[PDB]
Design a protein around this motif. Structure first.
Motif, PDB file in Angstrom:
ATOM      1  N   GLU A  61       6.830  -9.533 -10.060  1.00 49.82           N
ATOM      2  CA  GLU A  61       6.742  -8.127 -10.065  1.00 49.82           C
ATOM      3  C   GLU A  61       5.766  -7.471 -11.361  1.00 49.82           C
ATOM      4  OE1 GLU A  61       7.274  -6.012  -7.728  1.00 49.82           O
ATOM      5  OE2 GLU A  61       8.357  -7.396  -6.494  1.00 49.82           O
ATOM      6  N   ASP A  91       4.749  -3.802 -13.278  1.00 50.13           N
ATOM      7  CA  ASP A  91       4.905  -2.247 -13.477  1.00 50.13           C
ATOM      8  C   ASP A  91       4.398  -1.869 -14.877  1.00 50.13           C
ATOM      9  OD1 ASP A  91       5.103   0.321 -12.571  1.00 50.13           O
ATOM     10  OD2 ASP A  91       7.205  -0.115 -11.837  1.00 50.13           O
ATOM     11  N   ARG A  98      12.464  -4.105 -10.736  1.00 47.50           N
ATOM     12  CA  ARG A  98      11.820  -4.353  -9.490  1.00 47.50           C
ATOM     13  C   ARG A  98      11.874  -5.704  -8.943  1.00 47.50           C
ATOM     14  NH1 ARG A  98       6.343  -0.982  -9.184  1.00 47.50           N
ATOM     15  NH2 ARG A  98       6.132  -2.384  -7.203  1.00 47.50           N
ATOM     16  N   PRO A 133      13.551  -7.933  -4.714  1.00 49.37           N
ATOM     17  CA  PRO A 133      13.776  -6.826  -3.911  1.00 49.37           C
ATOM     18  C   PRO A 133      14.370  -7.432  -2.703  1.00 49.37           C
ATOM     19  CG  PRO A 133      11.386  -6.994  -3.912  1.00 49.37           C
ATOM     20  CD  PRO A 133      12.026  -8.031  -4.774  1.00 49.37           C
ATOM     21  N   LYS A 164      15.386  -6.157   1.561  1.00 45.84           N
ATOM     22  CA  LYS A 164      15.129  -5.351   2.674  1.00 45.84           C
ATOM     23  C   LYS A 164      15.900  -4.586   3.669  1.00 45.84           C
ATOM     24  CE  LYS A 164      11.585  -7.259   1.004  1.00 45.84           C
ATOM     25  NZ  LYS A 164      10.247  -6.938   0.557  1.00 45.84           N
ATOM     26  N   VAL A 173      13.094   6.595  -3.490  1.00 46.55           N
ATOM     27  CA  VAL A 173      11.931   6.311  -3.233  1.00 46.55           C
ATOM     28  C   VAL A 173      11.386   6.356  -4.710  1.00 46.55           C
ATOM     29  CG1 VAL A 173       9.796   6.596  -2.285  1.00 46.55           C
ATOM     30  CG2 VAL A 173      11.794   6.680  -0.817  1.00 46.55           C
ATOM     31  N   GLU A 185       8.296   4.648  -5.332  1.00 46.06           N
ATOM     32  CA  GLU A 185       6.806   4.712  -5.061  1.00 46.06           C
ATOM     33  C   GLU A 185       6.121   4.515  -3.721  1.00 46.06           C
ATOM     34  OE1 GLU A 185       4.567   1.247  -6.235  1.00 46.06           O
ATOM     35  OE2 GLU A 185       6.029  -0.015  -5.954  1.00 46.06           O
ATOM     36  N   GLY A 193       4.470   3.647   3.359  1.00 44.35           N
ATOM     37  CA  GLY A 193       5.001   2.605   2.555  1.00 44.35           C
ATOM     38  C   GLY A 193       5.807   3.339   1.638  1.00 44.35           C
ATOM     39  N   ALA A 247       8.746   2.020  -1.778  1.00 44.19           N
ATOM     40  CA  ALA A 247       9.833   1.008  -2.441  1.00 44.19           C
ATOM     41  C   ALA A 247      10.342   1.863  -3.382  1.00 44.19           C
ATOM     42  CB  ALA A 247       8.747   0.198  -3.391  1.00 44.19           C
ATOM     43  N   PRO A 273      16.947  -3.326  -5.966  1.00 35.68           N
ATOM     44  CA  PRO A 273      15.439  -2.652  -5.557  1.00 35.68           C
ATOM     45  C   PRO A 273      15.390  -3.163  -4.064  1.00 35.68           C
ATOM     46  CG  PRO A 273      15.193  -4.814  -6.753  1.00 35.68           C
ATOM     47  CD  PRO A 273      16.657  -4.405  -7.020  1.00 35.68           C
ATOM     48  N   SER A 325      12.129  -2.785  -0.787  1.00 35.77           N
ATOM     49  CA  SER A 325      10.787  -2.717  -0.649  1.00 35.77           C
ATOM     50  C   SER A 325      10.496  -2.827   0.974  1.00 35.77           C
ATOM     51  CB  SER A 325       9.985  -3.655  -1.411  1.00 35.77           C
ATOM     52  OG  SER A 325      10.345  -4.844  -1.055  1.00 35.77           O
ATOM     53  N   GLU A 326       9.203  -2.957   1.423  1.00 35.34           N
ATOM     54  CA  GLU A 326       9.000  -3.076   2.820  1.00 35.34           C
ATOM     55  C   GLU A 326       9.572  -1.803   3.722  1.00 35.34           C
ATOM     56  OE1 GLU A 326       6.269  -4.894   3.690  1.00 35.34           O
ATOM     57  OE2 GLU A 326       6.129  -5.796   1.778  1.00 35.34           O
TER      58      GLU A 326
END
Lengths: 436, 436
Positions: free
Chosen positions: A191, A193, A222, A225, A227, A362, A364, A380, A382, A394, A396-397
């Motif tokens: 990751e 950032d 992050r 992560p 799902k 959320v 981002e 989208g 994350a 964390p 994502s997707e």
């Protein structure tokens, strides 16, 4: 002699206007010049340092209600002459527009307020390199898991802006902007950032050490992560993405798209589009404000207003042209909004998590899924999954899908953790249960 | 007097070099000025027409192996003087870098080839408005389902570039670029797509009618997209996104990231990373080429090479600095690649669909999921589902995930339907069965 930049640009403006005066009914000229330093540090490498001067002279010329427009990045005397000549010639090839012209004389800021935007850094170039390097080092040191750097950076710039038009307006002002950033990569999967601080005065900036630490905290957060399955959940937009959520409003209330009948808010003026406790205030005159302006891109006076009052949309955002098309007067919006503020409802981000107690945060968003015509929203995302009022891990997707009409109207609350680094400033917002 | 722009810029360059000569060991100066016209049509509205002049003078100065860098968009005599002064001063604050300096004298193009890049449009401003408007109209007319326009547009620009350095190089050249585009919205749910044509000479451009029709065909094709379950499928990258797929290679073979040990290709030089029939040719000297150049951003001679030969990576892409760090000579890559060509294997796009017979065609990608360090690849995608060698329907909300090492090495074939509008030019590529 950059202490003279304002007098240099005033000549460029008034020379342009004189050149155009005999060949046109009206003309509007804008110059800006922004100069300063960019420093880039890469840990264990030679820093890169630059001086950048980026500038423009725009001109709009009006003849027989035909509009020419020309702009030049080169401010030399002959370059201004050619640009002016180019606008005049273009105006011979274009269709007349009775809605086109110089801004209404009565709305121009002839004597423009001092907004105190100018706070030159007293920093050595060497001192600036140490700032950038320090930020990067703070981040790299914080955890073993951070294996890579995309570098630190420092920027300091002073701009000078001058506007003039054939109504006899000539006004100009100075501004400063400074920033400090760092970007690193952490590994477990991988990751990356960033973190930053920004302001008109050096005293407004956070320390290098704060930026690095924050940069490490984010990147480490992050890592690894998970799902989510498709589910119903309430959703927080963290303050940093919450601002952008209200930012969509700008396009939907724009005078241009109103007369084009292209916004889903077309019929909404004077109606409640947002909860009844929420007010969006515009403070274009804020001392040292990030978006503060003495006047807009047309020289029109700029105004303190609640764009949204008790959830109700009060006004369109208008330029001279779109005001004339709509049979109104410009709202001083040429070139965008100046300083939006949304008050919090009295809670921290942590109090909101406790409040929600299970749901998505959320941090981002990706892509444009946001339609101005329909208000349709798909993006989208994350962020973090939350249970028991505490962040679990964390994620994502994810896809956030709704309509902005419904999203806006049903906002549960907005926090007090205020993102202060942007044009629009507000806290985190809690949306009702949706599909994620 | 734009017929004199080259002699104007040569003075700017050599004046800069003279100013710097006494205060530095070496200096490199680059100027470019790009001017021309932008037309925008919105159906049933007044077109917008502009003349734009955008320019820059960059300077890099070297003193005691300390590098200053300054750049100015304003080309006036005093502006050049200040920029030069700013580089010199910056070089007093920076760390010495024995790898830093002017490009090796023996590699500079002292006499630079004529690449025939200059083909000024003979078009009226009114004629240009009709081009833009015609494209938009072709699209709007093609189908009842197209309810909206984001407009047509036309652009024509001539650039002038001059480079000089303290080794005594002074060389410059002229170029032209023209384009025509349109963008519309179709409705059933709602989609928007664009089409365009581009070239150095007006005779290279497609008709307005071609652009509109193509714009309609694309937008209508995207209507009412379905979703796929997660599955194993072979995948075609349509030529338009295939170019970008090979584009990732540029970052991975960049000399800069090699000496930084930051590319997943670090150990791959001289090794097969791609199928043995595939060759990536670079033709920097192509007459009228979109990416053709007489010399690079350092003034280094530019070279005809197969960057990839029979699947094997032959060379890094190097600048003066990264060549010196790696103990090599620059490859003339400062400022990027010039004209990549990948031959097709002898089939059309339609023949590839028949070939695959069931699978995904990716016509567009979203976001950056592509890591230079790891070669990891994750990207949002949209496109068509194919069965029986024929497209069934549009699909979306897809994720393409792999590693570039595996993706590249295992490419099944590349088509003859060549995207000619980009730096990198190739056809559609067929990837082996993957998870989508």
């Amino acid at each position: 002699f950059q202490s003279n930049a304002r007098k240099i640009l005033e000549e460029a403006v008034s020379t342009a206007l004189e050149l155009a005066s005999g060949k046109s009914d009206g003309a509007e000229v804008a110059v800006s010049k922004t100069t300063g330093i960019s420093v880039s540090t890469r840990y264990g490498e030679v820093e890169n340092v630059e001086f950048n001067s980026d500038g423009a002279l725009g001109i709009t010329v009006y003849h027989q209600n035909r509009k020419g427009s020309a702009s030049s990045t080169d401010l030399s005397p002959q370059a201004i002459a050619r640009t002016v000549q180019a606008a005049l010639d273009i105006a011979r090839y274009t269709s007349p527009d009775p809605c086109a012209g110089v801004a209404d004389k009565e709305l121009l800021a002839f004597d423009a307020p001092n907004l105190d935007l100018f706070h030159p850094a007293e920093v050595s170039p060497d001192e600036a390199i140490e700032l950038a390097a320090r930020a990067e080092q703070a981040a790299l040191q914080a955890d073993k898991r951070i294996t890579n750097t995309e570098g630190g950076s420092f920027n300091s710039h002073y701009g000078v802006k001058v506007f003039g038009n054939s109504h006899g307006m000539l006004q100009g002002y100075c501004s400063t902007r400074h920033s400090l950033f760092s970007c690193v990569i952490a590994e477990e999967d991988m990751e990356r950032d960033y973190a930053y601080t920004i302001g008109r005065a050096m005293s407004d900036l956070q320390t290098p050490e704060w930026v690095g630490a924050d940069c490490a905290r984010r990147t480490l957060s992050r890592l690894s992560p998970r799902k989510l399955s498709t589910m119903k959940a309430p959703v927080i937009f963290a303050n940093e993405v919450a601002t952008g959520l209200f930012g969509h409003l700008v396009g939907a209330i724009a005078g241009g798209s109103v007369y084009r009948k292209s916004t889903f808010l077309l019929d909404s003026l004077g109606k409640q589009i947002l909860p009844d406790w929420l007010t969006i205030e515009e403070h274009p005159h804020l001392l040292k404000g990030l978006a503060s302006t003495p006047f807009d891109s047309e020289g029109v006076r700029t105004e303190r207003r609640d764009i949204i009052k008790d959830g109700i949309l009060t006004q369109w955002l208008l330029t001279s042209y779109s005001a004339r098309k709509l049979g109104l007067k410009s709202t001083g919006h040429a070139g965008g909004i100046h300083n939006w503020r949304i008050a919090g409802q009295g809670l921290s981000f942590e109090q909101m998590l406790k409040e929600m107690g299970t749901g998505l945060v959320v941090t981002e968003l990706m892509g444009q899924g946001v339609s101005a015509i329909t208000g349709d929203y798909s993006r989208g995302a994350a962020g973090f999954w939350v249970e028991n009022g505490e962040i679990q891990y964390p994620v994502s997707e994810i896809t956030i899908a709704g309509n902005l009409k419904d999203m806006w109207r049903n906002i549960v609350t907005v926090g007090n953790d205020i993102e202060t680094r942007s044009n629009i400033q507000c806290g985190s917002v809690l949306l009702p249960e949706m599909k994620i």
